[PDB]
Amino acid sequence: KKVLIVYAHQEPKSFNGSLKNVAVDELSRQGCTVTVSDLYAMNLEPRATDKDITGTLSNPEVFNYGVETHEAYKQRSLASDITDEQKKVREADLVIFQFPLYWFSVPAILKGWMDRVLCQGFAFDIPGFYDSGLLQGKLALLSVTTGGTAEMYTKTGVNGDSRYFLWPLQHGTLHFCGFKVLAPQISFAPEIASEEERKGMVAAWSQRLQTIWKEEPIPCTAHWHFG
């Protein structure tokens, strides 16, 4: 089994850093093939621009990013950074995303990865989205840290249920491309939590990774996310 970890934190000693390393350690220990895209260390280009196609653009007078990258994929003309990430995803049976929550979503660097890597022809098609997505057969999993407490992330809480913010990512992106989505790993409020609680959150993540291949995916539906 082959695992891609897409990681988006600036600081290796971070709680996010620890969770990534524990995933590398434990998956490597089981005998999985492990790859890590450390996006900040790669200085990954997040912007969707014409630099993402290498050669003459199909319509040079009026640039349409969606249309041009789809044609570029079919012609094998995408920038090498995109195509290298596409190779890693194509080979991967499981893709883990490790990141701190930025404005109820992924950090922009990781948003850029999503925007640029998962292009038409590679991740989806028409037809070929949701259960018919082109990355069907693969598993995705969001491992997210938050500043907000668990109690803030409830239906009655001030931020709403944590499942509300997962919708664009799990359904809108991952399910749309054909991933089956495993339950998210949410490590609430490591900054506020005690060191002993932090250790428990890391141990729980380690523990889960031991049996990750036997898990069932969630039913990625409106009903799951919104009750």
Ligand X SMILES: C[C@@H](c1ccc2nccn2c1)n1nnc2ncc(-c3cnn(C)c3)nc21
Using CA atoms, how far apart are residues 183 and 180, in angstroms rounded to an integer? 10
CB of 46 to a second copy, least distance (A): 4
Select 103 or 211, whichever has its Cβ closest to ligand FAD.
103
Torsion angles phi and psi, residue 11, rounded to 5: -135, 115
What are phi and psi for residue 53, nearest 5 degrees?
-110, 130
Question: What's the one-letter identity of residue 142?
Answer: L
Out of 38, 58, 104, 224, the only residue in the binding site for ligand FAD (CB under 6 A) is 104
Is 137 labelled as part of a ligand binding site?
Answer: no
Q: Is 130 annotated as a binding residue?
A: no
Structure tokens at 179: 């991933």
The residue type found at 58 is S
The answer to whether residue 21 forms part of the interface with a second copy (CB under 8 A) is no
Smallest gap from residue 180 Cβ to ligand FAD (A): 19
Least distance to a second copy from the beta carbon of 165, Å?
Answer: 5
171 interacts with Zn ion by CB under 5 A: yes
Given the rule CB under 6 A, which residues bind ligand X?
66, 118-120, 126, 147-149, 152, 159, 176, 192
Contacts of 157 (CB under 8 A, 6+ apart): 151
**What is the spatial distance between Cα 223 and Cα 26, in angstroms, rounded to a whole number?**
33
Q: x-or-dash pattern for ligand FAD, window 176-215, by CB under 6 A?
A: --------------xx---x--xx--x-------------
When asked if residue 167 is in the footprint of ligand FAD (CB under 6 A), the reply is: no
The verdict on whether omega for the bond into residue 127 sits within 30 degrees of 0, i.e. cis, is yes
Q: How many CA atoms lie within 13 A of 179 on its CB side?
A: 28
The site for ligand FAD (CB under 6 A) is made up of 9, 13-16, 18, 48, 64-66, 100-104, 115, 145-148, 172, 190-191, 195, 198-199, 202
